[PDB]
Amino acid sequence: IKQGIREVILCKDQDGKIGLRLKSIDNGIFVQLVQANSPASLVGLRFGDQVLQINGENCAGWSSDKAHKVLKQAFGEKITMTIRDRPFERTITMHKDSTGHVGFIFKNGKITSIVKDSSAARNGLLTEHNICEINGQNVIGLKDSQIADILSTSGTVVTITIMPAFIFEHIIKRMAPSIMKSLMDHTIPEV
Ligand SMILES: COc1ccc(C2(C(=O)O)CCOCC2)cc1
Numbered sequence: 001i002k003q004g005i006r007e008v009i010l011c012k013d014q015d016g017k018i019g020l021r022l023k024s025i026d027n028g029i030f031v032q033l034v035q036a037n038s039p040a041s042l043v044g045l046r047f048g049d050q051v052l053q054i055n056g057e058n059c060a061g062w063s064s065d066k067a068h069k070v071l072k073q074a075f076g077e078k079i080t081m082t083i084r085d086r087p088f089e090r091t092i093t094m095h096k097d098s099t100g101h102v103g104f105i106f107k108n109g110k111i112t113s114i115v116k117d118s119s120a121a122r123n124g125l126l127t128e129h130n131i132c133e134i135n136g137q138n139v140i141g142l143k144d145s146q147i148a149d150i151l152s153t154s155g156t157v158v159t160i161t162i163m164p165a166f167i168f169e170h171i172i173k174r175m176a177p178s179i180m181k182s183l184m185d186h187t188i189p190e191v
Contacts, residue, residue: 001161002085005052008043012076019185022051022067023171029059029067030088032175034138036185044189047138048163048171050084088167089132094119096156106131109140109147110165125160130168133161137188140172141180 010018019038022029031049034040051059054070062070071079094102096119103118104111109130114120131139131147135154139147151158163171172180 001089001091006083006085008045008081008083010039010043010079010081012079013039016076018071018079020045020071021175022064024062024064025170027061029062030171032171033179033183034185035183036187038185041185041187042190045083046086047132047140047184048086048089050087051081052084053082055080086161089161089163092123092125092160092162094123094125094158094160096158100152102151102158106147107144109144111162126162128165129162130165131160132163132168135159138184138186141177141184142186
């Protein structure tokens, strides 16, 4: 999680898309969706990012509709944005035990139990928190079984990005679970 305000420069694809849906939260604008292999993904926009400006206009108090409107009108050639990185999220680094567990239980992405004397317990993992990312890979909308698989196929060191469940549930309001499963970018980021 980068701790300040960064600039990104986007270019609409051939179809006039940038691969983004935005959501009004708390009189700010936040990324709700980033499409796989989109301009948004390529420049490193992530679920939960806060859009502070689009082409030098403040996003404060915009509706989701106005934000999507503003992206439609923009000259495709070059869109600038100012971004706060995942400001509602935090990162937690854990170490797997000899049996391959970081030490928590979760249901529909939300951590529900912390196991006594686990890495999760020592690193202060919290319940009623939704898993957004595992080792920088977005897992939002993936089945519980696949999130377990991605945890099992990570090394002994597991970084998990988490969001308070209330906040997460407010952000994904009005996005179909199939769009999340199907289109939400879940690739290991390119270099
Ligand atoms: C007393 O507080 C702590 C905090 C972290 C740990 C480690 C972990 O499990 O993450 C131990 C193994 O290596 C990494 C760190 C241990 C004790």
